[PDB]
Structure formats: structure tokens, C-alpha cells
Amino acid sequence: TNFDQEALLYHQQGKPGKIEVISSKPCATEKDLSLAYSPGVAAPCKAIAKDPAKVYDYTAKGNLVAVISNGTAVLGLGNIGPAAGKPVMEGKGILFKQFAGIDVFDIEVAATDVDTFCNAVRVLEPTFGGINLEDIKAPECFEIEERLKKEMNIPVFHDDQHGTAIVSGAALLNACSITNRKMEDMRIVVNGAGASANSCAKIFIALGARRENIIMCDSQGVIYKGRTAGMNKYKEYFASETEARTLTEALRGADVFVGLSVAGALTPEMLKDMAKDPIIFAMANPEPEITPDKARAARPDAIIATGRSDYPNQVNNVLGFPSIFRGALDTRSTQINEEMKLAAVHALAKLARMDVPDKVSATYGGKSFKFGRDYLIPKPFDTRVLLWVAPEVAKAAMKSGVATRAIEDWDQYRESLEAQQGPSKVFIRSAINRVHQNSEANGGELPRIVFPEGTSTKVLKALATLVEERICQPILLGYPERVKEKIKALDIPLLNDVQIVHPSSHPKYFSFVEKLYSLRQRKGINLGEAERLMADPNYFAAMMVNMGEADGMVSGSSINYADAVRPILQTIGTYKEGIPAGLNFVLLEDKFLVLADTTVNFNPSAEQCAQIALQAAKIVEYFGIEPRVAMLSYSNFSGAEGTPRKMKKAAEIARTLRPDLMIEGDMQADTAVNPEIMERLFPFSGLKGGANVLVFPNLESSNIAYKLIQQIGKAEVIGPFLTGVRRSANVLQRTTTVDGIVNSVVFTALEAQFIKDALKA
Ligand SMILES: NC(=O)c1ccc[n+]([C@@H]2O[C@H](COP(=O)([O-])OP(=O)(O)OC[C@H]3O[C@@H](n4cnc5c(N)ncnc54)[C@H](OP(=O)(O)O)[C@@H]3O)[C@@H](O)[C@H]2O)c1
């Protein structure tokens, strides 16, 4: 088919291969090269000589894992040599980085001999922090893995050996917990004994099971002690003394069936002879041992957990090894013992026993997952796997004593793992922590945020994420029966105690109408119009925030920006001199930039531009950053008629209002953001160090710039966030994702807290 040709093109387009080695530190200036190389490179080397433990602090040893192979068990191809298995190694390293943020040096060793292979790997100690054996044929894999573990003083893990056992072991706990099948009376049969099967039997035994109920099969029927030594000695370790010697006979009364063999190894005769709840594992990749559709045609009580991406409960190795190595490497452990492997088994099992956010669903075609029978293990592309399995593996290293580094703060450890998702995740987590610390000084009082669109799916999905973070107390607006129907349909268990208010049925509804009428009676609104407006949730939510029934509101997900801002501007107002304005955060690796005004004012005047700068400067001061404001123009300090004169005057007005801030203009965009340009060309400017607040002359420039930065610049931009309003209120867009709604609610909660304490003082 075209898939194989497309794969060849994927490995040949542009740069051949799939990996690239780049520098993580500045290496452009001569000073940069002198720091990275001689004579600056000698200083880190001296420290490692005195203290060998510093090799984990000055080099990339703490994040480097070697995927070493000899190419004798490359997938289903078999023994194709080490060079032919190179693309598999490169793909394995990609999975390591994409799911655990681990740098990988893939190694192919042209030595099929066990003794030669072990000596070559053993001398590679001072390079890598861990070794990942992969695609090594039996029985050579067992002997290589054992000696390497004893000799090498760094974690050694054969993914083909233990990786599948951990994922299947986690599924077994989830499968039995929904069938009342206590492991003490739990019969296990593994068909196709080999590299993975031996570890699977050992893993199950460590999971409260006994070898007496475990029987292993082979191509020559069912093996047992009566067989004349079978093959090798590894499979003889778990061999039982059961008289049965046929897969048909041995599967009678078998609680589970682990199909780690070739395709077409199941018959309906033993499919209807296992138990009241049989658990089967169709692990063969080229073709499943038993198709789930065929199994469903048989006894429906058969729990099926295959190993293919086209069916539920896929057993994927990518769930086990990235998080396990991340936990071992972060704790600087010296081994990957059974204690840590069991921790990953438990962590994966508990993770499936949890709610599935829309991020997992949207990744897999927008499906639904619950802890039932079609979802027994976390999905391979689930982001939370690293956030849950890795800390569990890290803890097991501490309790087993292998770990040589201490993780005292565990909340910081998860947010360090979460920080791998980008600067936007870091920025929002910092804002979430600020909300928590603001609430902690307020006595644990979370802000109340009302949503006029409780029927909206994106708002409801975002609220599922927001309640777990303890950011706010959400209030939904609408018919309680109509929104609870959608809450149940979308299956959020956390959104069950959430308060739902119908505007017309509220006890304070008629008091709200009188307040709206008194505010708008000489602005074209009569009593009949006020009653009709107050029935609209957007107007009702604005009056709850204005009166005090809520601290903030988030709307605009189902209407245009202009139609959603209007109730906020009419019910709530602006402050003494405030002006409504949209605000965007441009999140860079080192700093962040504030852009205003991006959504409201078409052509602000000099007085309005100065007010916009002051509002944006206060938002920057929320985070403890010193605001440095630049009025943007197409010219550099000219004051010519039009925009340059307006922006020059805007800076003068703003400096008068807040004389303790760095406000300057008019400049160009590159002059504002580059400190080197400012010092070289305009040393007279009062703005030093670069601007972090950017004020635009009109809406065309501000809107186009932040949308071009988001698209072309590939920088993280979050917003827009409404500013200049008397109370906390934010307006979404129809195109906002649930992640953008989460950021908007976090900003609304942050602004509500600041408005609350400012009003308190
Ligand atoms: N996705 C996963 O998590 C995962 C993990 C492991 C394996 N698998 C799949 O499961 C299969 C087996 O694993 P493997 O790669 O280790 O296999 P393998 O050893 O390469 O070959 C299967 C072995 O099982 C035995 N066997 C062959 N046909 C059999 C049959 N009809 N009934 C019973 N035993 C039979 C043979 O043992 P003798 O050599 O003693 O005759 C053979 O060596 C492969 O298809 C593999 O891709 C999937």
C-alpha cells in the first residue's frame, strides 16, 4: 500500500533520519564558545574530578537514556542486523522525548554474542544515566539483561521484557476490580511463552498471585514439569505440575488467557469454558489472536484487552517505559527493581480509575472513556500518564533505597513535569498558584464566577478541569433541568454540586430588574424592556457581579464579542477613568509581553491610549514584574502629524499620571522590545531594558500583530482578557478552546481577588 511508501518519504524528506542533536545553551558569541569550550570547559571538569556526583549536575547524564540493540529481534522482522534496526531505535528515542522529555542516544551494536555485547555496553557507564535494551532475541536477551543489571551501576531496562508485563499487569488489576475476582483464587494461562511471557507471569505473581494457578503454553502444546526440560531454563522457573498438556484442556477454568503468541491461536470451544468473567489478552500485533468482534459474538462477559490501536484497551509499551525512566532518572536511581515496576503497575491502574478530560478525548477523535470494560488502562497519548506514573515510580525508588537524590517537594515535582508542555503551561500554573495563595490569605474563600452559558459544551468541559484546580465556585445560568440533562450527557461527575440559577426564577430577579431600570431608564430602557433584558443570562450574570452575588463572570462563547461586551459595559461600568480594553500575553521562554488594546478600541486617542497603558501596567504589576511601557508607532521619536504625535502625547499623559513607571514613545516595535537597539540609537530614552507592555495606536495594528505572532511567530499568546471594567468580567470568543476558557477563568479569578482586596482597603 501507500503507507509503506509514505513511511519511506517520512524518513527521507529534508534531513534524512528522525533525530537531531542541538545545543541547549547559547553558543553563538565568542564569549559563548569560550564558556562551552576551552578555557571555560575546564571548570566543570575540575568539579566532577573532585566530586563524581557532579556529573549529574554539569552534564546531560541525568536526562540521557541509551536505547541499545543488536538487531536480532527487530519487531516481527526478526534478525535483520543492527544497521537495519536503526529506524526502530530512532523512533523509540522520539517516543522517549515526546512522552517523558528524555534525550536518547540510540545505539546499534554489531555483536550478537552475549559476552561481547555485555562488555561493549558495560564500558558505556559514564555516558548515559540509563540503558534501555530493545529488540534482543531470546534466550540471549535474558542473559544480557541479567549481567548488565549486576555490573552496570545505572538503571537497565529491557522494554520487550518488562514493558508489556507492566501494562498488562495494570490492566489485570482494573479487569479484576470490576469483576470481583480476588487474586488468591485467580487462574492464569499464558500462551506463547517467550521474552515477554516470563516477565508477565512474574509480574502477576508479585500482584498477589501464586504460580500454582499459572500455566504456560508453547507451540508444542501446553508445557509443564513433565516435559523433558522444554527449552533453556527460564521457562522452567514458572513451570507447574499440571497434567493438562493441551491448550483446549488447559483453558478450562482459566480465569485469564494471556495471548503472547502468533495469530489464530483461539477457538470458541475454550472461549465458552473459562469462567463467568474471562479476561483475554490478544497481544499479537500483525493480527490479533482473537478479534474483539469475534469475542463479542461469544460470551459477552469476556473482558478483552488487545494490543492494537484500532480497539479499546490497547496494550501499548509506550505507557510504561517513558514514565518509569523519568522517575528513575529524576531520583538518580541506580536500578529499576520490581518495587518500582509494581509502582508503575499500580499508578497506571489508578489512573484509568479516574475521569477522562477532553484533551484525551479530542486526541482520539472525540470519543468517551469511563472506568468500565472498554477503558481499563490509560490511553497511550494521555498526558497525565507522565504526571501520575513518574512520581509513583520516583517514590518507590526512595522506599527501596536505590534513589541517590531527594525529592522533598512533590507538588513542585509534578509541576516540573507539567512544565514540559510549554511556557503557557508554566504561566497558567504560576497564576493558579497565585490564586491559591491569594485565597489562602483570604481564608480559603474561592471567588464565585457565574457563567451565562451553562448549556455550552466547551464551558462545561472547561469547568471539569477548573473544579479540580480549586480555582473558583462556578454558577451556571439557565434551566436547571435543561443544563443537568447536558451535564449528564457529557458525563462530568464533578459538575454535579455546581450551583445552577435560572434568572427569571431567582429570588432577587425583580430587585435586579429595578436596579437595571434605574440605571437605564433615561438611556432608552423601560420597565418592560428591563424585565426582558434581565431574563437574558448575559445581563443577569452582569448584575450578579455588579450587585455582589458573584465575584466575576465569563461569557461570550456563544455570541459575538460586541454582543457579549455590551451587557458588561451597561450593567457593570468602568472605574473613575478606566476604559474597556483587550489584553494579550505573549509568553516567551524568558519573559512575557503584554499587548493592548487588542479587541475593543478602534482608534483610541492620546488620553485613551495613556489609560490603556495604565490598565495594562497594573496587570503586569499583578505578577511582581516591573512594567515598562512603550507607545508603538511606525516612526522612532518623530512626533509627526498623526499617529506619531498621538503616541508621543500619550506617553506624556501616562508619565504624568504614574511618574514612577518607564513610559516612552513614540517608537517602532523593534526599538521597543530590543534593549540593544534602544541603547545604540536612542540613549536619551527613559525606557531601559526593553518594554514588556506594548500599546498600539489603533485596533488594526494590535489585532493583526498578535494574530500574526500566534501564527507566524509560533509564540504562545493567551487572551484577550478584558480590562478597565469596574468588576471582574471576561469575554470569550466563539473559537476559544476549552484550554483558552480555563485561562480566561483563571484570569477572572485573579482579577476578582485583586478587586476584592482593593475594595477591602
Ligand atoms: N504489543 C505488545 O505489548 C506485545 C508484547 C509482546 C509480544 N507481542 C506479540 O506477541 C507475539 C509473541 O511475542 P514475541 O514477539 O516474543 O514472539 P516470538 O518468540 O518471536 O514467537 C512466538 C513464540 O511463541 C511460540 N509459538 C509460536 N506459535 C505458537 C502457537 N501457535 N501457539 C503457541 N505458541 C506459539 C514459539 O515458541 P518456540 O520458539 O519455543 O516454538 C515462538 O518462538 C508477537 O506477535 C508479538 O508481536 C506484543
Numbering used by the authors: 12 to 772
Which of the paper's sentences describe this entry?
While reducing NAD(P)+ to NAD(P)H, MEs catalyze the oxidative decarboxylation of the TCA cycle intermediate L-malate to produce the TCA carbon source pyruvate and a byproduct carbon dioxide (CO2) in the presence of divalent metal ions such as a magnesium (Mg2+) ion. The hybrid-type MEs consist of an N-terminal catalytic domain (ME domain) and a C-terminal activity regulating domain. The PTA domain does not possess an enzymatic activity of PTA but acts as an allosteric modulator of catalysis; that is, binding of some metabolites to the PTA domain increases or decreases the enzymatic activity. Binding of acetyl-CoA to the PTA domain is known to reduce the catalytic activity of several hybrid-type MEs.
